[PDB]
Each structure stands twice: as structure tokens, then as C-alpha cells.
Amino acid sequence: MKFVYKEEHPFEKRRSEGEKIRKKYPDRVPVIVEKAPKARIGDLDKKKYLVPSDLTVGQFYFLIRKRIHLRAEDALFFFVNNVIPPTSATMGQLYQEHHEEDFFLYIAYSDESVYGL
């Protein structure tokens, strides 16, 4: 997936920010959240999150749903490298497994249960 954040900031600038924020806040992880292409879902006002490592994916879902102003029956799915993470996993575990070389974790969100469909 193309993330706008990656297209707008060269890798060396993102990597230096990721290293700095990880050294400054060792118990938090930096997360970029963007809408999947051709998803049919409301926009997200902010894309750059500094998240406690012990926050769960499910707790992050709840917060992101509220930021988008979704109704209960409006679906929301997270994808990390096209895979939906478990809601009981911590954001720190997801970050350790899947953060990119700029030290950011990248999450795509969609209304759909499969990426790219």
C-alpha cells in the first residue's frame, strides 16, 4: 500500500523522527493510520498517533471509530501488511512485529473485511 505520509516525507526524515520519538518515549510507539484506497468510509482527521505500548488493538479501534464518527453498524477494519490484527494484541506487540525501517507502524483502515476488495 502507498501511504501518503511516506510519499510526502523522504525515508531519512521519517527514520530520524521515528528513532527520536522511540528513544524519547520508550513505552510508546508511533503509528500512522490512513484510509485504504477505494474504501467507502469517513475520513480520519489525524494520521499520526503516539500510542502506549500496552494499549490493545481493540482499544485503538474504539478510539479511531469515534474519531471518524462511525455509527455502531458501520464496519471498521485495520490492516497491517494486508492482515487484520487481533483485538487482544497490544499495540506494542503489533509494532514490534511489523514496524517499518523508519520506526513507524503503518495501519490502513477500511469498511471492508478484506484489503483491496
Binding site: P30, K48, Y49, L50, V51, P52, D54, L55, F60, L63
Partner: peptide, 8 residues
């Protein structure tokens, strides 16, 4: 530019 998230 960070949105700070906290444990509930």
C-alpha cells in the same frame, strides 16, 4: 504533530 493516545 502527534495525537497523544492514553490508556482508558
Amino acid at each position: 504533530g502527534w495525537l497523544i493516545i492514553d490508556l482508558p
